[PDB]
Ligand SMILES: CNC(=O)COC[C@@]1(C(=O)Nc2cncc3ccccc23)CCOc2ccc(Cl)cc21
């Protein structure tokens with residue numbers, strides 16, 4: 001029993017974190033095989049800025065060992081520093097781009113040293129509500145699939161509202177952001193509906209049933225209601241993905257949608273669900289199954 | 298900016314997780330140097346659990362009865378001893394991944410990271426606190442026994458918890474790494490219940506200071522309070538008494554924000570009285586009590 005916001009074990013990623021220094025800027029790099037990946041803002045016309053840099057300008061530090069940079073290239077908003085040494089701790093990995101609503105673990109780092117690990121979701125507005133201080137750029141987001149690390153995020157910036165923006169490991173930003181000091185704002189955010197439904201199923205699995213009702217709803221009526229509360233539309237794909245949880249608890253997805261509809265129109269009334277007074281949207285249906293079944297890595 | 302429930306990076310602990318099997322019972326062990334630590338109830342059957350005589354059960358065991366598995370390698374047990382509620386299995390190999398470590402016993406209100414494991418394999422990492430009633434509100438399924446709680450301050454891992462049981466309310470009880478249970482719990486299936494839990498007041502105050510550091514000031518008021526008046530109010534909401542130690546501990550956060558501890562106590566009194574009125578503090582509609590003053594300073598600064 002119990003339901004916690006749980007991150008993936010960070011060990012396979014910890015063995016990849018390095019410190020990258022260029023001039024006065026120090027941030028984090030991800031060392032995989034013989035390449036160190038980091039935000040290109042460590043060096044704006046980035047082709048013009050990069051052409052002026054030589055390999056020896058980039059100081060890469062893996063623990064108490066200085067790696068030697070033997071090449072450099074830019075791929076979108078990520079700088080790829082070719083080093084002479086392949087990381088012996090390189091795990092089986094992939095670079096994957098995630099969609100809004102998908103969750104991942106963040107290994108927050110400062111000076112190439114991991115400081116903490118937390119779980120978060122790619123918001124529908126493409127920002128992450130992370131926890132990052134100055135020096136955290138280059139910290140990465142990931143998931144683990146069996147023994148394979150899927151790198152999905154690299155931290156680049158903090159927006160004026162305190163939320164965070166970054167890229168995939170191919171340097172493509174999530175969201176309409178640019179890596180430049182300029183007026184940028186996170187768009188109006190919405191609630192990840194499929195994730196709230198997954199969290200309501202997790203609450204049922206843990207004995208919380210007070211919010212259940214005899215009612216059901218159509219997918220169209222639920223979406224008309226959900227749109228009124230700044231909730232993301234629920235698609236038939238989401239309904240299908242919630243299938244296993246529906247089968248395990250005996251509560252049809254549209255039956256749980258009627259519960260969610262009543263929760264949105266009437267509130268919690270002094271009650272909590274899994275120790276929360278708000279509807280939690282940073283657990284995907286897969287996170288719920290994984291935690292309520294004990295999948296290991 | 299931002300404030301998250303943050304766990305320590307689990308890598309140093311992952312390299313210590315092993316699977317311990319004794320008879321039909323399989324749980325997790327913590328392999329440090331040439332010793333594997335695990336709950337002593339691994340020697341029990343589901344029947345033995347009611348009134349086990351662990352000394353009597355252990356004396357009947359030999360080293361080859363304990364099967365220890367580190368990854369795809371079977372370690373050889375060369376000795377065994379019991380220290381309180383923890384079984385210490387001496388093995389023929391020192392763990393090459395043994396980090397710099399200490400065994401520390403924590404007090405209620407202290408936080409730590411839990412590396413939840415099943416079959417000696419890490420499944421997830423989460424943050425939690427030792428509740429005032431000495432239980433932890435974890436996420437543990439059957440097979441999670443032996444999963445450990447820790448803090449990684451600097452390069453040293455401080456092991457503070459080992460999971461042993463789930464009480465009937467879905468909460469968890471366990472021991473320090475010397476096998477001493479936290480709370481009035483015993484590793485028996487006799488009727489046991491968690492005492493009435495309370496809110497960790499010093500931690501809520503620390504989290505209100507974290508909210509101020511992050512720009513949230515809506516809950517502040519022009520009032521102050523005496524420590525005694527705050528405690529009389531706090532105890533009516535099942536909040537732990539705030540001691541002068543807690544007030545002293547909150548000193549740095551008070552200095553950084555410019556809000557005296559007794560001023561922040563007056564804001565807490567008002568929040569307890571009014572609720573949040575549709576507002577949130579650091580994205581929460583409840584007062585968060587699983588961030589200590591040390592966690593807030595570490596994360597915010
Ligand atoms: C040494 N590195 C830095 O100075 C990082 O600052 C980059 C920076 C940024 O916002 N990053 C930061 C990341 N996380 C948390 C932060 C907290 C406080 C201050 C900065 C933070 C500075 C501000 O404007 C831009 C614009 C565009 C890009 Cl792409 C980045 C940035």
Ligand SMILES: CNC(=O)COC[C@@]1(C(=O)Nc2cncc3ccccc23)CCOc2ccc(Cl)cc21
Nearest residue numbers: 001322323437438439440441461462463484485486
């Ligand atoms: C593999 N399992 C075991 O070795 C036996 O389980 C131990 C057990 C226990 O409570 N463990 C468990 C730990 N965490 C979460 C759990 C969730 C569901 C079921 C069991 C859980 C079984 C029940 O009664 C006792 C009594 C006292 C002690 Cl100290 C332990 C126990």
Ligand SMILES: [Cl-]
Nearest residue numbers: 402403404407
């Ligand atoms: Cl302590």
